Design an enzyme around this catalytic site. Sequence first.
Site, PDB file in Angstrom:
ATOM      1  N   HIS A 114      33.985  55.138  46.268  1.00  0.00           N
ATOM      2  CA  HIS A 114      33.693  53.706  46.317  1.00  0.00           C
ATOM      3  C   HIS A 114      34.450  52.988  45.204  1.00  0.00           C
ATOM      4  O   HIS A 114      34.454  53.440  44.055  1.00  0.00           O
ATOM      5  CB  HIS A 114      32.188  53.508  46.165  1.00  0.00           C
ATOM      6  N   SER A 138      34.073  50.908  54.584  1.00  0.00           N
ATOM      7  CA  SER A 138      32.764  51.090  53.958  1.00  0.00           C
ATOM      8  C   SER A 138      31.836  51.838  54.917  1.00  0.00           C
ATOM      9  O   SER A 138      32.128  51.944  56.111  1.00  0.00           O
ATOM     10  CB  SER A 138      32.177  49.726  53.585  1.00  0.00           C
TER      11      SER A 138
HETATM   12  N1  NAI Z   1      32.452  49.207  50.220  1.00  0.00           N
HETATM   13  C1  NAI Z   1      32.757  48.101  49.278  1.00  0.00           C
HETATM   14  O1  NAI Z   1      33.437  48.293  48.310  1.00  0.00           O
HETATM   15  C2  NAI Z   1      32.235  46.778  49.552  1.00  0.00           C
HETATM   16  C3  NAI Z   1      32.319  45.793  48.580  1.00  0.00           C
HETATM   17  N2  NAI Z   1      31.843  44.577  48.852  1.00  0.00           N
HETATM   18  C4  NAI Z   1      31.920  43.518  47.831  1.00  0.00           C
HETATM   19  O2  NAI Z   1      30.740  42.814  47.733  1.00  0.00           O
HETATM   20  C5  NAI Z   1      31.027  41.468  47.570  1.00  0.00           C
HETATM   21  C6  NAI Z   1      30.450  40.765  48.769  1.00  0.00           C
HETATM   22  O3  NAI Z   1      30.634  39.369  48.879  1.00  0.00           O
HETATM   23  P1  NAI Z   1      29.805  38.404  49.832  1.00  0.00           P
HETATM   24  O4  NAI Z   1      28.324  38.789  49.759  1.00  0.00           O
HETATM   25  O5  NAI Z   1      30.291  38.387  51.268  1.00  0.00           O
HETATM   26  O6  NAI Z   1      30.151  37.052  49.108  1.00  0.00           O
HETATM   27  P2  NAI Z   1      29.679  35.596  49.332  1.00  0.00           P
HETATM   28  O7  NAI Z   1      29.133  35.307  50.691  1.00  0.00           O
HETATM   29  O8  NAI Z   1      28.636  35.255  48.234  1.00  0.00           O
HETATM   30  O9  NAI Z   1      30.941  34.655  49.043  1.00  0.00           O
HETATM   31  C7  NAI Z   1      32.231  34.906  49.611  1.00  0.00           C
HETATM   32  C8  NAI Z   1      33.378  34.271  48.973  1.00  0.00           C
HETATM   33  O10 NAI Z   1      33.234  32.862  49.068  1.00  0.00           O
HETATM   34  C9  NAI Z   1      33.079  32.340  47.790  1.00  0.00           C
HETATM   35  N3  NAI Z   1      32.084  31.280  47.787  1.00  0.00           N
HETATM   36  C10 NAI Z   1      30.769  31.436  48.034  1.00  0.00           C
HETATM   37  N4  NAI Z   1      30.169  30.237  47.957  1.00  0.00           N
HETATM   38  C11 NAI Z   1      31.098  29.302  47.655  1.00  0.00           C
HETATM   39  C12 NAI Z   1      31.038  27.923  47.458  1.00  0.00           C
HETATM   40  N5  NAI Z   1      29.808  27.256  47.560  1.00  0.00           N
HETATM   41  N6  NAI Z   1      32.177  27.265  47.172  1.00  0.00           N
HETATM   42  C13 NAI Z   1      33.343  27.926  47.074  1.00  0.00           C
HETATM   43  N7  NAI Z   1      33.437  29.258  47.256  1.00  0.00           N
HETATM   44  C14 NAI Z   1      32.323  29.967  47.549  1.00  0.00           C
HETATM   45  C15 NAI Z   1      32.726  33.508  46.932  1.00  0.00           C
HETATM   46  O11 NAI Z   1      33.092  33.282  45.618  1.00  0.00           O
HETATM   47  C16 NAI Z   1      33.464  34.570  47.521  1.00  0.00           C
HETATM   48  O12 NAI Z   1      34.804  34.504  47.110  1.00  0.00           O
HETATM   49  C17 NAI Z   1      32.503  41.375  47.502  1.00  0.00           C
HETATM   50  O13 NAI Z   1      32.900  41.426  46.113  1.00  0.00           O
HETATM   51  C18 NAI Z   1      32.963  42.525  48.144  1.00  0.00           C
HETATM   52  O14 NAI Z   1      34.191  42.997  47.586  1.00  0.00           O
HETATM   53  C19 NAI Z   1      31.285  44.264  50.029  1.00  0.00           C
HETATM   54  C20 NAI Z   1      31.171  45.199  51.041  1.00  0.00           C
HETATM   55  C21 NAI Z   1      31.650  46.488  50.787  1.00  0.00           C
END
Ligand code: NAI
Lengths: 313, 337
Positions: A114, A138
Site C-alpha cells: 500500500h 486497491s
Molecule cells: N489504495 C489507496 O492507496 C487509496 C488511497 N486513497 C486516498 O484517499 C484519499 C481519498 O480522497 P477522497 O475521500 O475521494 O477525497 P475528497 O472527496 O475529500 O476530495 C477530493 C478532491 O477534491 C478536493 N476537494 C474536496 N472538497 C473541495 C472543495 N470544497 N473545494 C475544492 N476542492 C475540494 C480534495 O482536496 C481532493 O483533492 C486520497 O488521498 C486518495 O489518494 C483512496 C483510495 C485508495
Amino acid sequence: ISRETLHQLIENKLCQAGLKREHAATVAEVLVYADARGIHSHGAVRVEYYAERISKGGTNREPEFRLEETGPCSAILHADNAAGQVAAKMGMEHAIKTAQQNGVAVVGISRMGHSGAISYFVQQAARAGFIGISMCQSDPMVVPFGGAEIYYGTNPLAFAAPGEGDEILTFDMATTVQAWGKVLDARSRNMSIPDTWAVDKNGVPTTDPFAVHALLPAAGPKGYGLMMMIDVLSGVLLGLPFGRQVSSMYDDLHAGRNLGQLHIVINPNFFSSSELFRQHLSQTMRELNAITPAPGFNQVYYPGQDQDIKQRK
Amino acid sequence: MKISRETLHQLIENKLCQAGLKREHAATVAEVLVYADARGIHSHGAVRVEYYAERISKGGTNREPEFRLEETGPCSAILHADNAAGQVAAKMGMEHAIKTAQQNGVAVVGISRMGHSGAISYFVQQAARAGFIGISMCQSDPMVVPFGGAEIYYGTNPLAFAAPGEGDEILTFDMATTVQAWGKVLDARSRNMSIPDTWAVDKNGVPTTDPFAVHALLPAAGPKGYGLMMMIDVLSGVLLGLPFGRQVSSMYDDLHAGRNLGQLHIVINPNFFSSSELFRQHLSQTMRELNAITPAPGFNQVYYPGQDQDIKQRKAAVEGIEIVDDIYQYLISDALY
Ligand SMILES: NC(=O)C1=CN([C@@H]2O[C@H](COP(=O)(O)OP(=O)(O)OC[C@H]3O[C@@H](n4cnc5c(N)ncnc54)[C@H](O)[C@@H]3O)[C@@H](O)[C@H]2O)C=CC1
Ligand SMILES: NC(=O)C1=CN([C@@H]2O[C@H](COP(=O)(O)OP(=O)(O)OC[C@H]3O[C@@H](n4cnc5c(N)ncnc54)[C@H](O)[C@@H]3O)[C@@H](O)[C@H]2O)C=CC1
C-alpha cells in the site's frame, strides 16, 4: 508535535520493525504528509498496521529493486513487494528524471505494498516543475454500476501541477462516492450513513454501515469507468493481478500485496513556455478563488485548496 | 427516421463540402459524427452539421488549414491545426500518436487550435484498433460552475479511454465531466419537461428543475468532476499555451472566428510493458466477468463500461442509425443554414 517529531517517531518504530532506516524514513515522510491534509486515514494511524506486516514478511524488508527501462519514456520498477511508499517514491524519481530529459515518462510500479495518499507522489513531480499524474489499484470493495458483487477497489487518481514560486495545485480522489475510511469512521460512532455511499450484500443502497457489503462508484457509471481505467493502466498493463484478483489488506499479512501503480509525468517545456504555464496555473488558482460562491458556501476553493489550507494549520 | 451508415455519411460529407470544406475533410468529419450517432451520442452527431456549415461558410472553421506537426521529443508533439475542423485535426494528431507509440512506446500529442471535435472516444478507438491504449481529453465552451461556485469557468471537458481485447474487441469509456452533458438540458428544452435538480444551476448558483432557468451545469460528483475538468483544461489547454478556463471560446461567440480549442492525446503501447497477448486476453476477461456479475434489484444485467453504447452501435449496423427527421431534411436540401 512537529513534523520532525513524528517522522523520527515513525522512522524509529518502522526501523525497529524491520525496514532499513532509509525505507523507514520514506514511509514516515508520506505518512506525515497525509495527516496534515485531513487524510488522517493514511497518516500516523497506519503505522502499527505497517509495522505488523513488516514483522510478518507481508511487506518485503529486503526488496531487490530493479528499474527496467523499456523505452525513451517508459519503465517498470520491479518492486519485490517493498513498502508502497518507498516503491512509488522511487519510481516517481525515475519518472521525473525521464521527463526532465526526454519530455514525458510513463513508469509502472510492479508488485508493491500500500502506498497511501498518492498525491504525495504527484507533488514530487510538481516540486520538480512538472505535471504529475498517478493512480493505483486497491482492495476489491466496489460494486460495478448496477451490480451486487465486488470487483474493483477504491482505485485513486491524483494530479499536481506547478504554479509560480512554491505554489502547487494538487488534486486527489477515490473513485468511490466516499473513501472507505469514513465508513468505519461512521461504524465507530454508531451513526446512520448516507444512502449514496454503499450497498448491502444484495447491492441495495443502505443506511446501516454494519450492513454495508460494498461501496458505490462515484457518479454511477462514471466512477465505474474510472476505476476500470485505473485497473487497466496500473494493473493489466503491468501483467499484475487485476479486478477482483487484487489482494486485500487482511487476506494474508504474510504475503506480498502485488499491487500496481502507474505514474505519468509531463514536462511543460516540451509543449509551451514553462514560465507562462506556471503563471497560468497561479492565475487559475487566483481566478477560481475569486469566483462568486453559491448559496451554502463561504468561498470557492481551487481544487485541493481545502487540503492545502489544512496542511499549513 | 432510421437511416444506414453509408448514406448518412455521404449526406454529411456532401453538405460540408457544399459549405466549403475539402471533401476528404468533410469525409473525416462525417466519419466521427456517424460514429457518435451509431453509439447514441446524438448531441455530437449529425445534429451539428447545420452549425458546422455556417461556421465553415463564414470562415470560423479553416477550410484551408496550414497543418504543422511539431515533433518536440521522442514521445511528444503538437499538431498546430490552424483552426481546422476538430474531427480532422484530432484524428490527424491521433495518427501521429499511434505511429509514435508503435516506435517509442508512449505518445503525448497536443492538438493546438482546432474547432469542435465531437464524440472524442472516436479518437481513442483509433488507438485501440492499432492494439494500443488510448486516452484523450479536450476543452469545451465555458458552461460549468466550480464546486461551490455560481459563475461559469470550465466546460463539459470530456475524457475518453479505450483498450483492446482479443480480436476485434475494444473496451471504450467516454464521459463529460459534468453531471449530465449539455444536450440533456437541450433535450428537456425541446420536450418542455422538468429536469432533476442535480444537473444544473440558475444565474445565482441555485440548483433548478426548470431547463429554461439553467445558467450553468454542475460538475459530476461535486469536487471530483471539478478537479477532473480542471485537469483536462490544464492538460489540453494551459499545457499547449492556449486560452484556458473562462477564456475558452463559446460556440456562438463569433461564427467568423476560429475556436482555438485544445485537445490532448495520450497513447500507450502495451508491448513496452508486458505480454500484449495476455493484456488483450485480460481485457476480454474483464469484459466477460463484469457482464456476469449478479445484478442489483431493478437491473436486468450488469454491463462492462461502455457496453451500453457498444450494444447500440451493434444494433445500428443491423437496423440502421436513428437521427431526427429534420436533420435529414436539412441534409438533402440545398439550404446551408
Ligand atoms: N489504495 C489507496 O492507496 C487509496 C488511497 N486513497 C486516498 O484517499 C484519499 C481519498 O480522497 P477522497 O475521500 O475521494 O477525497 P475528497 O472527496 O475529500 O476530495 C477530493 C478532491 O477534491 C478536493 N476537494 C474536496 N472538497 C473541495 C472543495 N470544497 N473545494 C475544492 N476542492 C475540494 C480534495 O482536496 C481532493 O483533492 C486520497 O488521498 C486518495 O489518494 C483512496 C483510495 C485508495
Ligand atoms: N466539446 C466536446 O467535444 C465534448 C464532447 N462530449 C462528448 O459527449 C459525450 C458525453 O457523455 P456522457 O453524457 O457523460 O455519457 P454518459 O453519462 O451516458 O456515460 C458515460 C460513460 O459511461 C458509460 N455508461 C453509462 N451507463 C452505463 C451502464 N449502465 N453500464 C456501463 N456503462 C455505462 C457510457 O457508455 C459512457 O462510456 C461523450 O461522447 C463525450 O466525448 C462531451 C462534452 C464535450
